[PDB]
Amino acid sequence: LDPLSETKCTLKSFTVEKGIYQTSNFRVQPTESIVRFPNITNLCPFHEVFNATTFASVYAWNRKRISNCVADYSVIYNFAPFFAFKCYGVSPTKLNDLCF
Amino acid sequence: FRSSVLHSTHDLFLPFFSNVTWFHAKRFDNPALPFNDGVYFASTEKSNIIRGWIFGTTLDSKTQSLLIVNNATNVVIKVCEFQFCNDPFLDVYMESEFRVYSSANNCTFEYVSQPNLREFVFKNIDGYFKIYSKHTPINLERDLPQGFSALEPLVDLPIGINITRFQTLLALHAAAYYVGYLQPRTFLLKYNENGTITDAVDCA
Amino acid sequence: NFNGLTGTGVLTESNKKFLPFQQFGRDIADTTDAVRDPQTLEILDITPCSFGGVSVITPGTNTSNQVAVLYQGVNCTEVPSNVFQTRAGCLIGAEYVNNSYECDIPIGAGICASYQTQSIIAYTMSLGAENSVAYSNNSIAIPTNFTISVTTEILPVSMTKTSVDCTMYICGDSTECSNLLLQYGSFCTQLKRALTGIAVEQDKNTQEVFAQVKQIYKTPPIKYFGGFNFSQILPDPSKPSKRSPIEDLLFNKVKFNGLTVLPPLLTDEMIAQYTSALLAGTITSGWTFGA
Amino acid sequence: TPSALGKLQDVVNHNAQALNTLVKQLSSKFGAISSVLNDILSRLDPPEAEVQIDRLITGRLQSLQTYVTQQLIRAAEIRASANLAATKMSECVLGQSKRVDFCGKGYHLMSFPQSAPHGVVFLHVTYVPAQEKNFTTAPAICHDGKAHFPREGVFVSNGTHWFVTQRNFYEPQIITTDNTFVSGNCDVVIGIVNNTVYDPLQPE
Amino acid sequence: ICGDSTECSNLLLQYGSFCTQLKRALTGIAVEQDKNTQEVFAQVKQIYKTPPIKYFGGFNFSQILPDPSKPSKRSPIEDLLFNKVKFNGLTVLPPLLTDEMIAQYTSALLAGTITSGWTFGAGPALQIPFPMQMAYRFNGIGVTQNVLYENQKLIANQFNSAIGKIQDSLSSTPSALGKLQDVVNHNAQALNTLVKQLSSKFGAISSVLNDILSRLDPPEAEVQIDRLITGRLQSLQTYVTQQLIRAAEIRASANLAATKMSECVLGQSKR
Ligand SMILES: *[C@@H]1O[C@H](CO)[C@@H](O[C@@H]2O[C@H](CO)[C@@H](O[C@@H]3O[C@H](CO)[C@@H](O)[C@H](O)[C@@H]3O)[C@H](O)[C@H]2NC(C)=O)[C@H](O)[C@H]1NC(C)=O
Ligand SMILES: *[C@@H]1O[C@H](CO)[C@@H](O[C@@H]2O[C@H](CO)[C@@H](O[C@@H]3O[C@H](CO)[C@@H](O)[C@H](O)[C@@H]3O)[C@H](O)[C@H]2NC(C)=O)[C@H](O)[C@H]1NC(C)=O
Ligand SMILES: *[C@@H]1O[C@H](CO)[C@@H](O[C@@H]2O[C@H](CO)[C@@H](O)[C@H](O)[C@H]2NC(C)=O)[C@H](O)[C@H]1NC(C)=O
Ligand SMILES: *[C@@H]1O[C@H](CO)[C@@H](O[C@@H]2O[C@H](CO)[C@@H](O)[C@H](O)[C@H]2NC(C)=O)[C@H](O)[C@H]1NC(C)=O
Ligand SMILES: *[C@@H]1O[C@H](CO)[C@@H](O[C@@H]2O[C@H](CO)[C@@H](O)[C@H](O)[C@H]2NC(C)=O)[C@H](O)[C@H]1NC(C)=O
Ligand SMILES: *[C@@H]1O[C@H](CO)[C@@H](O[C@@H]2O[C@H](CO)[C@@H](O)[C@H](O)[C@H]2NC(C)=O)[C@H](O)[C@H]1NC(C)=O
Ligand SMILES: *[C@@H]1O[C@H](CO)[C@@H](O[C@@H]2O[C@H](CO)[C@@H](O)[C@H](O)[C@H]2NC(C)=O)[C@H](O)[C@H]1NC(C)=O
Ligand SMILES: *[C@@H]1O[C@H](CO)[C@@H](O[C@@H]2O[C@H](CO)[C@@H](O)[C@H](O)[C@H]2NC(C)=O)[C@H](O)[C@H]1NC(C)=O
Ligand SMILES: *[C@@H]1O[C@H](CO)[C@@H](O)[C@H](O)[C@H]1NC(C)=O
Ligand SMILES: *[C@@H]1O[C@H](CO)[C@@H](O)[C@H](O)[C@H]1NC(C)=O
Ligand SMILES: *[C@@H]1O[C@H](CO)[C@@H](O)[C@H](O)[C@H]1NC(C)=O
Ligand SMILES: *[C@@H]1O[C@H](CO)[C@@H](O)[C@H](O)[C@H]1NC(C)=O
Ligand SMILES: *[C@@H]1O[C@H](CO)[C@@H](O)[C@H](O)[C@H]1NC(C)=O
Ligand SMILES: *[C@@H]1O[C@H](CO)[C@@H](O)[C@H](O)[C@H]1NC(C)=O
Ligand SMILES: *[C@@H]1O[C@H](CO)[C@@H](O)[C@H](O)[C@H]1NC(C)=O
Ligand SMILES: *[C@@H]1O[C@H](CO)[C@@H](O)[C@H](O)[C@H]1NC(C)=O
Numbered sequence A: 001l002d003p004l005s006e007t008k009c010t011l012k013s014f015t016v017e018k019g020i021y022q023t024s025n026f027r028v029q030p031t032e033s034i035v036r037f038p039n040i041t042n043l044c045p046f047h048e049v050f051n052a053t054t055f056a057s058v059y060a061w062n063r064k065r066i067s068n069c070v071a072d073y074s075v076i077y078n079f080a081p082f083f084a085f086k087c088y089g090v091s092p093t094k095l096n097d098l099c100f
Numbered sequence B: 001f002r003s004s005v006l007h008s009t010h011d012l013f014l015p016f017f018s019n020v021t022w023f024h025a026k027r028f029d030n031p032a033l034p035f036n037d038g039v040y041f042a043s044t045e046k047s048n049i050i051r052g053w054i055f056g057t058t059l060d061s062k063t064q065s066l067l068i069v070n071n072a073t074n075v076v077i078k079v080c081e082f083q084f085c086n087d088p089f090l091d092v093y094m095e096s097e098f099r100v101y102s103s104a105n106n107c108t109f110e111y112v113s114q115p116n117l118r119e120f121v122f123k124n125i126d127g128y129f130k131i132y133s134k135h136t137p138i139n140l141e142r143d144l145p146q147g148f149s150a151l152e153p154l155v156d157l158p159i160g161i162n163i164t165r166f167q168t169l170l171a172l173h174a175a176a177y178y179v180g181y182l183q184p185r186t187f188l189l190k191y192n193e194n195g196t197i198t199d200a201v202d203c204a
Numbered sequence C: 001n002f003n004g005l006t007g008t009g010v011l012t013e014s015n016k017k018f019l020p021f022q023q024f025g026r027d028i029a030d031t032t033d034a035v036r037d038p039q040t041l042e043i044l045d046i047t048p049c050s051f052g053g054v055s056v057i058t059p060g061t062n063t064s065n066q067v068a069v070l071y072q073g074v075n076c077t078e079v080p081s082n083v084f085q086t087r088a089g090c091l092i093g094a095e096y097v098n099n100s101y102e103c104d105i106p107i108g109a110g111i112c113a114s115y116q117t118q119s120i121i122a123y124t125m126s127l128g129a130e131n132s133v134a135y136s137n138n139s140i141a142i143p144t145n146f147t148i149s150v151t152t153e154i155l156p157v158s159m160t161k162t163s164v165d166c167t168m169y170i171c172g173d174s175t176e177c178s179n180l181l182l183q184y185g186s187f188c189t190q191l192k193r194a195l196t197g198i199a200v201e202q203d204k205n206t207q208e209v210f211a212q213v214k215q216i217y218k219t220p221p222i223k224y225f226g227g228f229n230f231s232q233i234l235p236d237p238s239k240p241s242k243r244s245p246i247e248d249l250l251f252n253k254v255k256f257n258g259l260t261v262l263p264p265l266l267t268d269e270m271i272a273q274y275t276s277a278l279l280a281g282t283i284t285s286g287w288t289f290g291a
Numbered sequence D: 001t002p003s004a005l006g007k008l009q010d011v012v013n014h015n016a017q018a019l020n021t022l023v024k025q026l027s028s029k030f031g032a033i034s035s036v037l038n039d040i041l042s043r044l045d046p047p048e049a050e051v052q053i054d055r056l057i058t059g060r061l062q063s064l065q066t067y068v069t070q071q072l073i074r075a076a077e078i079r080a081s082a083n084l085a086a087t088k089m090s091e092c093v094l095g096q097s098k099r100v101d102f103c104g105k106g107y108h109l110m111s112f113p114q115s116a117p118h119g120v121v122f123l124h125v126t127y128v129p130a131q132e133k134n135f136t137t138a139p140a141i142c143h144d145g146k147a148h149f150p151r152e153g154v155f156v157s158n159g160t161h162w163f164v165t166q167r168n169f170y171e172p173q174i175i176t177t178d179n180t181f182v183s184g185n186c187d188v189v190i191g192i193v194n195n196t197v198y199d200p201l202q203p204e
Numbered sequence E: 001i002c003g004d005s006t007e008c009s010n011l012l013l014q015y016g017s018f019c020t021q022l023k024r025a026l027t028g029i030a031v032e033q034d035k036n037t038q039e040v041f042a043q044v045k046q047i048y049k050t051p052p053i054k055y056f057g058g059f060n061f062s063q064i065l066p067d068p069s070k071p072s073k074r075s076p077i078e079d080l081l082f083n084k085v086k087f088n089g090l091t092v093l094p095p096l097l098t099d100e101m102i103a104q105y106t107s108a109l110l111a112g113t114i115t116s117g118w119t120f121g122a123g124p125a126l127q128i129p130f131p132m133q134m135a136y137r138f139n140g141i142g143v144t145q146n147v148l149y150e151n152q153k154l155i156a157n158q159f160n161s162a163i164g165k166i167q168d169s170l171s172s173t174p175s176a177l178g179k180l181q182d183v184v185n186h187n188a189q190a191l192n193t194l195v196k197q198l199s200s201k202f203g204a205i206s207s208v209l210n211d212i213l214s215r216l217d218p219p220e221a222e223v224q225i226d227r228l229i230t231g232r233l234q235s236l237q238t239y240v241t242q243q244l245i246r247a248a249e250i251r252a253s254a255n256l257a258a259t260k261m262s263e264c265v266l267g268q269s270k271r
Helices: A004-009 A073-077 C166-170 C177-183 C186-208 C245-253 C268-284 D004-025 D047-092 E005-017 E020-039 E076-082 E101-114 E130-140 E147-149 E152-171 E173-199 E207-215 E222-265
Strands: A020-024 B008-011 B022-023 B038-043 B051-055 B065-069 B076-082 B110-112 B117-125 B127-137 B165-167 B176-180 B183-191 B197-199 C008-013 C024-026 C032-036 C045-046 C054-057 C069-072 C083-086 C089-092 C111-116 C117-126 C129-132 C138-158 C162-164 C260-261 D109-115 D119-137 D145-148 D152-156 D162-165 D180-185 E046-051
Touching: A004 C054, B008 B038, B022 C260, C138 D004, C138 D047, C138 D152, C162 C186, C162 D047, C166 C177, C166 C186, C166 D047, C177 C186, C177 D047, C186 C268, C186 D047, C186 D119, C245 C268, C245 D119, C260 D004, C268 D047, D004 D047, D004 D119, D047 D109, D047 D119, D047 E020, D047 E222, D145 E147, D162 E147, E005 E020, E005 E207, E005 E222, E020 E207, E020 E222, E046 E101, E076 E101, E076 E152, E101 E222, E130 E147, E147 E152, E152 E173, E173 E222, E207 E222
Parallel strands: C129 E046
Antiparallel strands: A020 C054, B008 B183, B022 B176, B038 B117, B038 B176, B051 B065, B051 B165, B065 B076, B076 B110, B117 B127, B183 B197, C008 C045, C024 C032, C032 C045, C054 C069, C069 C089, C083 C089, C111 C117, C138 D119, C162 C260, D109 D119, D119 D152, D145 D180, D152 D162
């Protein structure tokens, strides 16, 4: 309620005998979430995956390795109407907050 | 960053006054040295002679291997399952050579970023492959002059491959280098007001 | 959260000179106090925002209810009706007066508070009254009178001798728990021996303080010694325990969970008799019986 | 002024709160499920009850160790205080101490002991000077062509006459031979003045 | 122990009043350091002032008396002495008496001891010429009063040459003030030990609470967080015990200094 009340709670008594009693502490935290990572530059080549016209047949599906890059999965909603988007492994939407 | 403080850390350091192998320069002195927990590399080549480093355990296209060729213009760091024979060489013909390896299985990593006593430290721990470097000029006779030259971090790339041996290749058509072995010790580093290390003290 | 480095603090434009590879800055306490932005290469300093035990300056609830707080170690600009910036921290609830008085409630470096016209006020304590000694190479001052002043000094002598049972306090009338206590070694033996040593030490302290006399001296029937009245220190037979009025005031003004309190070896009557013997000796023998 | 006897009140309060805090930690729940043991052995399996109660033993054993350490520190402090009190008894009550501010504020004459709960109170009868008057002084006196110095006292002047009085009490005495010394001539004393020195042997 | 962690804060309440005893012990030391200075320097209640700068009996007190040239109002010896002697919840509290007030107490004691002798220790400060003041001190050690009067010019020269050598003695050889610097050295190294044990590894997967709370199961990681609470609370207990021991040592030293002031400065001692 007031400094006198927490002073009484610290001494565990309803009376005070004219002293300087250490009661509590103080802090401040109005904001957070400042710049974390540097310029995202080396994007993963999702252009030659979702925009490539020449796709191989299902019996001879292509195998393309994606590594050493930043996978901006937000571009999937651009190069395709995301009709049958279904993530069976981790999460459909929670995909940019984890790494492999 | 550290400003005018003394910091002691238990890490793989080169022991002071230890036993370091030297190769006093077609004479190349490449005996396919082994690779312990750390290799300290230093050279005094004339001009762009010692610009090759390979790593790996078995090297017979069965384990991951390293191939760092400077190409006189960049730092071509590529990780793949190369095939190294009993004697690699870089006898160009320009600035092109292929007889170093003969196969490439996966090639899962590539790094081609841009770059007279040159010093290097190659460490592999927790999957990462730490790389340090430092270039300081010398003018006296070739005797590894006494002093202090702190090595700055260069690449620090994560790979995760297994490395137990390493070899150095030179381009052909002085060539002296040093190979030191890092050991688990405890040093006492002194940093200046700008963060530059001035001297170290081996506690053992 | 610079590159994963989590923390909380103020970020100001730093004048440090890092190296191209360095990203963080540490002090001798292995604490990150300087950091660089990952996008822009500008260096920033990390300082702790605010923390300090707020001491509520209270003049006692028996007098009044107004209180004052003291945010120790922080300015008055980072706090959420008088506000004054003392060198010990921001003080809220008391104004600073220029007059200097005696230090009543210690507030910090040279600042003390008191309940005076009411409201709480802070000021610079006065070390004493100014007295210019009129020195001269031929001036002397000789006292023409005197004043017999009886001062009091209070010093503790002994503590309360206590002894605690190890197993009965830790577990208590238990068997499955007492078996695990045996695995802890002889820690129970150390505490008991330490408490017995403390008890015999308090007994020895009482003996060395009060039992300095070899015999017990008593005063003759009270008569006119020299005009001095010792009735305040001499015991009286009309009151039990044979304590003087001063000792009576001293005595008036000043379950077992495995722990017990041991009674003193010398009771309140034996110490009273030792004090009476010391007094009777020092009034009829002076410094002679002590030698 | 209840704060006067605060020295012994603090002792008894520390003796009380040390036992009250020790028994208050008995009802604690250090990383456990319940503070009492009957609700642990009769509710949890023996393989887990021995692990859960072991943390309660360490919490209560640490409380006993802290209690014993604090009691030892307080016993050392009280032993220092009791040694001081015994020395003060022997040097103020059993005699007269010349040590200033040891047996009261002023010139100690005698002291009286008084018994107190877990302590002792001394009554210091001190001699305090007061009501002083300023006078003119001189280091020596030149009467018979030679300097004179007071045996036990000081030389004071009320403006016209000179007298020798006690250093701590005002008692003017006529400067005579049995109250002054004789050493040296009247040339090395800085500030020596003239005055008559009486001699009871000359008229008789 | 926690450092802005809600899970640790609510869990620390189960350890009882261990935090209360540490704060009470640290506050008992704080009020002890202020009482020590009040018993050593705060001897007289009257702030005596030195007369205008002159000579008393040929003795040159320019090295111990305060000079109005410097703003700190400290004597040359005090200046030479002074010229060579918050993070992670650690807050250093300022002493009740500042260095300016301690200098004023010292100046008052000095003006009392050079203009009144030991008379200001038992009561009012009585005027007395410093030549014949030291003459009384010769009579106390068994030397007649006439020796000082016949060697006053020699006593003043030996005194002034000795006081002047004190500056050269305490200036060079910095090991002379080692007894007083070791106190702050021990305090600083104890604070460094207390702040460095925060990054310890008492058995948890990491030293930071965020690296453990985000990795392990919050309801399961309680038994591992408690392993760091005990490691950090025992460090605080060790720090408080060492501080209490050093406080007892400093209290003994301060009582010795108070006896020294009351007997050597406020009077003449035969011990
Ligand atoms: C990360 O990206 C930011 C934003 O693109 C970069 O900041 C920009 O860096 C450039 C190059 O140093 C600065 O210079 C020039 O500014 C003028 C305007 O005055 C502009 O017309 C030029 O095209 C050029 O950008 C630019 O001022 C600066 N802008 C900001 C807002 O900071 C930053 O350099 C990048 N960092 C890395 C390591 O790539
Ligand atoms: C590095 O060494 C090589 C040969 O050992 C030097 O020749 C250059 O080799 C690179 C590839 O290794 C060539 O880049 C290529 O460009 C084509 C487009 O023209 C692109 O489709 C390829 O994927 C590849 O990136 C480069 O053209 C070639 N230079 C010349 C003049 O033929 C090379 O100069 C050395 N230095 C560097 C910085 O590469
Ligand atoms: C460094 O190691 C080499 C060998 O690894 C040492 O050379 C040997 O020296 C001993 C004498 O102590 C000889 O008996 C051996 O025959 C040498 N072996 C070889 C292969 O030459 C060399 O002494 C070591 N140096 C230091 C400073 O320890
Ligand atoms: C640390 O960095 C500072 C800043 O660059 C260096 O100070 C410079 O020193 C040179 C050589 O003495 C001067 O020419 C410059 O004028 C200085 N800079 C400034 C801003 O005055 C300092 O020398 C560096 N420390 C070391 C040990 O090299
Ligand atoms: C010594 O002093 C005490 C009190 O300080 C005297 O006791 C009082 O004596 C008067 C008689 O004049 C009584 O009216 C009071 O009731 C007494 N008070 C107490 C507390 O006993 C005592 O008489 C004095 N001694 C002498 C010899 O006169
Ligand atoms: C200083 O003291 C002397 C000594 O007592 C004073 O002289 C006396 O004066 C009275 C007053 O007439 C005479 O009755 C005495 O016979 C004098 N005695 C002597 C020894 O001379 C003198 O008056 C005092 N002066 C002052 C200024 O107080
Ligand atoms: C009073 O004191 C003065 C000063 O000490 C005496 O004057 C000195 O007398 C001696 C011997 O008579 C001379 O050798 C000195 O040269 C004198 N000094 C001065 C400064 O005059 C004086 O004799 C004393 N007695 C009287 C009656 O005056
Ligand atoms: C006392 O001694 C000092 C030096 O030992 C003399 O010099 C003075 O020194 C102080 C600093 O301690 C300066 O503040 C003064 O300005 C100095 N004075 C002079 C004249 O140089 C000092 O003169 C001596 N005092 C006397 C009265 O002789
Ligand atoms: C896909 O590639 C074509 C060229 O092959 C290009 O014109 C187009 O902008 C790319 N992106 C999309 C979304 O079509
Ligand atoms: C893989 O690395 C380990 C070091 O941890 C080494 O002992 C082992 O021999 C390496 N494997 C091969 C095939 O060399
Ligand atoms: C302080 O306490 C005393 C004793 O209980 C009481 O008589 C007095 O009235 C109190 N002060 C005030 C201002 O009420
Ligand atoms: C604010 O804090 C700084 C830091 O100690 C201090 O120097 C200053 O006097 C304080 N007050 C103001 C008004 O800046
Ligand atoms: C000395 O002081 C006492 C008490 O102050 C007083 O009773 C007495 O009359 C004084 N004597 C003289 C001579 O002034
Ligand atoms: C000594 O004491 C007795 C008894 O009190 C008394 O009668 C006598 O007068 C005293 N002597 C003197 C000189 O006062
Ligand atoms: C004492 O001082 C006063 C005031 O200065 C002065 O009038 C008086 O003469 C002095 N006493 C003596 C004995 O000189
Ligand atoms: C006392 O000091 C004053 C002023 O310095 C001086 O005039 C006088 O001669 C001195 N007296 C003696 C006896 O030295």
